[model samples]
Target: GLFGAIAGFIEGGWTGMIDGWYGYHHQNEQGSGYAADQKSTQNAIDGITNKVNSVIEKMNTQFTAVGKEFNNLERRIENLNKKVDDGFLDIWTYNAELLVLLENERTLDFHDSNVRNLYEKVKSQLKNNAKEIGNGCFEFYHKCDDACMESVRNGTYDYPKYSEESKLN
Candidate 1:
């Protein structure tokens, strides 16, 4: 609002807001020492709020564009195949299912020992599984890019075959 011709409301609107909910107050019971608009409390705040709203509305428009891009990346990442980390702890579930196997062997002490041993071995590779998962996706992307490049050159796409596996290396 001040395109200030000259002078100040520099009563400071922010100073008022921070002064508290009732806002900065002044009492001068004198008849008249200032102009009518000199003590602009609400008008000063509305001017600041209107200026802020004018700029904030533009970001709402931007969030729509950001939302569209964000959704597409989430969707495209799904495109590669549900193959990424699904199998990560797949054996955790698979191994847990073996509780039934252990229960089946709970019939006899001898069988229980064998089932417990097998269960231990089944999960022994848990650490190795994590190590391999680290590189598994990295390796897949090379194959993905290689196949994608090859398909474009040939103008035909078909399921991979064992003989074609040599091309990946």
Candidate 2:
């Protein structure tokens, strides 16, 4: 009779206690847990959208600076070409025609060599580094996209939760 009383409490009293505890903690007044979950998910999506827009703006600013550098390089090349052309024209029209041709030819060759060296030292390096940075950015974006897709397929992302047993291990 004693154990039967304890069994009755276990079945009825303990069950009611647990129900009361759950009702007290998880009080969904509208009974629309799904609506609450959807709102939280929407907020997370909006946060990611804001971050994507921010990254796009920063990339555009950086590329604009790169375009300005290219423009400056073009201006320098145009100025050099004009100066060299004028020098050659002046020498060709001078009194000593043969000597002028010889000296001007040598000067043109030296100018071309220097121009090539400068291109190799400056433009080549800039282009190579920019390419590497672009590749890296694309790779990271693809990886994030893949992860997002996987999370969508799984219906949710599974982040680790800490537990006392886990902490001990």
Candidate 3:
């Protein structure tokens, strides 16, 4: 999300900066002007070109940061998926174990504190695990939103228009 936004912003900046620089350059080099006028205009263009180049460098650096953030978020999602898979596996294993235990008919004899405790432990863990997975999904969704915001910040992409006509209320 971060990278996407940064790229957009950088693109927007690049577009704006280049447009400005070229406009000035074109005006000074081709448009009629006195010696002093031409010198002054070209000097201004030089200053702006320097600044825009500096900004372009900074924008690239920020882009790398955004990429890393997305990668981290991707890893987080993978880990959460693993946990959810484990919870499902736990359910399957628990069911099989429960069926065997019931069939054994010696549950009363073997149903000591340890067995009872293990069952409850897994059950409780799964309940919490389900909730945790849900939370992780929420976090992931929000991170995507953050990425979108980053894109909007960069102005690489235009803000969406929902109205059918050009004017919006």
Candidate 4:
């Protein structure tokens, strides 16, 4: 249970880190009754190893469908980013940050391909939308419509609604 969340996060790096950390702390924590000997800690490490491997399997399956929602979240947020512009940073600048990591395919590969693919899809969509809604018009009409925000948040957007030409805008 110690590495529960990060367990779903991956196979080697994160898992090994957690297992090593757990292995060390586990030895200290379970030293109450019979003492956490090498066999006991080794047993716990094996269990951690098994669970991490099991979660990788489940993560692969779970994220396959789950990534669509991840995409929708990116889509809606970045679309709004174009409109809002925020005057601060781009709302989803991290998308750009992640894109650079794309060059290092093996890096993303370690994080799971489903996530990597979805990020790639989002990168492509962002590129297309920027071209679609260029000239800063996206921000020009932000406050002109509250309904677009509603549609975006509610996942009810019909694409053009988030653009400057929306009827409400």
Candidate 5:
């Protein structure tokens, strides 16, 4: 009876060990499959993140270029404004010179040949200066519409008279 019991115990232990080994192999297979799945998913996420970063970098480059262009445009506008201001002052000085010349001519003796020659020279200069101013005024007014200019020229904005014809000359 003791020999029979020992044989039964040995058979049961051998069966249990074989089952344990099979279970370990099955668990390893499952773990390996899960690791592969996780690796592929992580790879996909990394690829999308790289693409998004690339797009953002491209946008930053474009914005930087646009900002430089805007700065250049502002500098050009400032230079133009300075030139226009200087030109305006020059025109005013020319006008003052013409007024002084006219006032002096009225007091000069016109019968003398030298006086006549000097008068003619000054008259020519005044005519040229007036033409310069007139051209500048025309150039400035050309930017606005004719109808708007007409209203301002006619004094429609109201002052002392209701329908007064305002003359710039």
Candidate 6:
């Protein structure tokens, strides 16, 4: 049943719902104006629900894309960390070799002048290697720091609220 284009049912609907449920005298009156078009009302309700479901589906698709990007970023960062670990290990190896050479020079009293000179030369090379390794470590630290800071500044990292201090810095 079409009740024309009149949507002025607010006043009557409110009064009807409240008075009809209680023992008010208005209970003897006609049903609520909202019940005038049972089919049309149901159809309108269905349309609204459909629209909400459509919006949710769109949001789900967007979230799937975001999740994929997050996985890619995670793998890339893991590879970088592995490189840093390997580089630092090489540094430690050179350091240990240099220490052993220094110890042998102190304990062993080899009279061969040539052997002593070679040991000193090797020790100098190892010292230079250790310095280079330290610079490499610093390079890795700088790169990681820049990448992490860039992500935070660009709002690429999620939970911007939780990263308030990072963002501020």
Q: TM-score for every candidate vs. truth?
A: 0.19, 0.20, 0.20, 0.20, 0.22, 0.22
Worst 10 residues of 3 by lDDT: 135-144
How far off is residue 98 in model 2, in Å?
1.6
Instruction: Put down candidate 4 lDDT per residue, 8-78, tens digits, no spaces.
Output: 33222223333222211111122311111233335555755665576455433322321122365487776
Q: Give the per-residue lDDT of model 5 (tens digit) for 87-136.
A: 86698678657655763453232212222332233234333222222211
Best by lDDT: 4
* Model 2: per-residue Cα lDDT over 1-169, one tens digit each: 1222222222322233231111111112323111112333344447546655654564433223211223665888777776776786686556346544765565444433432332233223223222222211111111223343234223442232111112222
Candidate 6 Cα lDDT to native:
0.34
Q: For model 3, what is the C-alpha lDDT against the true structure?
A: 0.34
Local accuracy of candidate 3 as per-residue lDDT tens digits, 58-154? 4333223211223665888777777876886798678657755653443232323222332233234233221222211111111223333333222
Colliding pairs, model 5: none
Judged by TM-score relative to the true structure, which candidate is superior, 4 or 6?
A: 6
- Report clashes for each candidate as comma-separated counts: 0, 0, 5, 0, 0, 0
lDDT of each: 0.33, 0.34, 0.34, 0.35, 0.34, 0.34
Model 3 stretches with alpha carbons more than 4 Å out = 1-72, 106-169
Instruction: List candidate 1 segments past 4 Å from native.
Output: 1-39, 61-169
lDDT of predicted model 2? 0.34
Better of 1 and 3 by lDDT: 3
The regions of model 2 sitting more than 4 angstroms off are: 1-95, 131-169
Ranking by TM-score: 6, 5, 3, 4, 2, 1
| Clashes, model 3 | 5
Error of 3 at 24 (Å): 99
Q: Tens digits of per-residue lDDT for model 1 on 1-169?
A: 1222112222223333343211212123332121122223344456546645754553343223211223555866664334443563475557556644663343233323332332233234222221122211112212323444233223332333223444334
